[PDB]
């Protein structure tokens, strides 16, 4: 009756709403930060998308997302690379042109599954076969 659309947008493996909240570099959404995690394993792995690229680099970008889907391991292994792509590529309107060109040329010799976003999607398989690496399960006679 009314042309009321939900602003459906895409993400790595989930849905999103296409209405971003601009701000003054506030990496949070109004009641909770995410970045304070302290895992004791992947610390340098999370510092890699930022510490090698530029320490703060958040004077002109925020992350404003709430999505329920995908997975937790996918979330940790996807959102950091996602904002890395946001800060190195989407910032071409803002960041220095020679700086981003140097960065892309530096990462051309760095694409070793460290600057790759998780493009994984859930898929169902069919009943009748289960094997992946070993053999199947069949009887004699």
């Amino acid at each position: 009756a009314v042309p009321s659309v939900q602003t459906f947008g895409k993400k790595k493996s989930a849905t999103a709403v296409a209405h971003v909240k601009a701000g003054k570099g506030l990496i949070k959404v109004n009641g909770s930060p995410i970045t304070l995690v302290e895992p004791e394993i992947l610390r340098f792995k999370v510092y890699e998308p930022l510490l090698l690229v530029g320490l703060d680099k958040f004077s002109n970008i925020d992350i404003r997302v709430r999505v329920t889907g995908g997975g937790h391991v996918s979330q940790v292994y996807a959102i950091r690379q996602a904002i890395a792509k946001g800060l190195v590529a989407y910032h071409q309107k803002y960041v220095d042109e020679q700086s981003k060109n140097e960065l892309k040329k530096a990462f051309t010799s760095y694409d070793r599954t460290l600057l790759i976003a998780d493009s994984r999607r859930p898929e169902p398989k069919k009943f009748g076969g289960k094997g992946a690496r070993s053999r199947f399960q069949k009887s004699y006679r």
Partner: protein
């Protein structure tokens, strides 16, 4: 209201072609003989939830075997028909095996 249109989603589900052609020919000839709106059905990627009772205990030897597969040909109708004839489609052509999910959603 009188002559309500709540649009319970009729869920056309069959196994064999003798019943599939039966129900599909039935609904379309019903539409043809009481002059329903001209909007026909198409099939679907069928709603298969994987459940089965396998009897293959131990894996010795080689494979001289088939595939355990079956297609429940759950299809649908894209139309704007009344809830009345949606109910009468279930009332007539009585055969146990056709399921109808109670879903108030037209399109």
């Amino acid at each position: 209201q009188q002559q309500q249109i709540i649009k319970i989603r009729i869920t056309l589900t069959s196994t064999k072609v003798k019943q599939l052609e039966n129900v599909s020919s039935n609904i379309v000839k019903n539409a043809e003989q009481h002059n329903l709106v001209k909007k026909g059905p198409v099939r679907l990627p069928t709603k298969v939830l994987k459940i089965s009772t396998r009897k293959t205990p131990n894996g010795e030897g080689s494979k001289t075997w088939e595939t355990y597969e079956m297609r429940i040909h759950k299809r649908y109708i894209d139309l704007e028909a009344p809830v009345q004839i949606v109910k009468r489609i279930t009332q007539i052509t009585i055969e146990p095996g056709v399921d109808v999910e109670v879903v108030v959603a037209s399109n």
